[PDB]
């Protein structure tokens, strides 16, 4: 059919794809620092992390007004991790493991919107 | 004239178009998170926009959003 939650699941597919490029550009920046100017590698990382956290804030806000609380539970723990980084503002091995999980989490949830949206459109 | 389900869809589409235009203007005209909201607001209210997107991937968002606010306003009237 046509519901407000069905449209919210459609905007996520276009927006979550942009969040994929951020975590992919992150592992590239960490790969360059592992091989080795150093200011440009970290200052750019500070500029890319802010939109990634703000865009996900809409994912927790769109589904809140869409009454789809079954999907919100799959995004609340992701937003809680952003509060730890925002509060406090070797490290290479720790941050590397803290970024590979982002690519897997932003991809497994990406397939949900590709299927949960179909579960409402064709189900008219 | 417009159901309450459409008014909730317009606001999130307005912000959704705005955040995409900011992401398009980031991979490369400033078009920050603030100027994109102003340009999209000036385009939805049929007013004269201050600036226009320079890149092709930014011009697509402008032309598509222009067709969106034209159909919605014409349907509301």
């Amino acid at each position: 059919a046509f519901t407000f939650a069905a449209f919210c699941y459609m905007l996520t597919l276009v927006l979550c794809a942009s969040l994929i490029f951020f975590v992919i550009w992150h592992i590239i920046a960490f790969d360059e620092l592992r091989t080795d100017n150093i200011e440009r590698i970290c200052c750019l990382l500070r500029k890319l992390v802010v939109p990634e956290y703000s865009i996900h804030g809409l994912f927790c806000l769109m589904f809140l007004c869409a009454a789809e609380w079954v999907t919100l539970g799959l995004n609340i723990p992701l937003l809680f991790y952003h509060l730890w980084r925002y509060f406090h503002r070797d490290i290479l091995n720790y941050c590397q493991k803290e970024s590979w999980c982002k690519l897997a989490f932003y991809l497994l949830s990406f397939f949900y919107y590709l299927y949960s949206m179909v579960y409402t459109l064709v189900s008219f | 004239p417009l159901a309450y389900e459409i008014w909730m869809c317009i606001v999130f589409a307005y912000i959704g178009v705005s955040v995409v235009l900011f992401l398009v203007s980031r991979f490369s005209n400033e078009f920050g998170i603030f100027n994109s909201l102003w340009f999209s607001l000036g385009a939805f209210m049929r007013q004269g926009c201050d600036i226009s997107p320079r890149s092709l991937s930014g011009r697509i968002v402008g032309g598509v959003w222009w067709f969106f606010t034209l159909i919605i306003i014409s349907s509301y009237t």
Binding site: - | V17, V20, V24, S57, V64, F67, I72
Partner: peptide, 24 residues
């Protein structure tokens, strides 16, 4: 239909931005 057109335009713009970023 206009919402579908909006979503398709956003997706096409994202793809064109990806292409133009990978062009360099």
């Amino acid at each position: 239909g206009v919402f579908y057109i909006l979503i398709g335009g956003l997706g096409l713009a994202m793809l064109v931005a990806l292409i133009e970023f990978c062009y360099k």
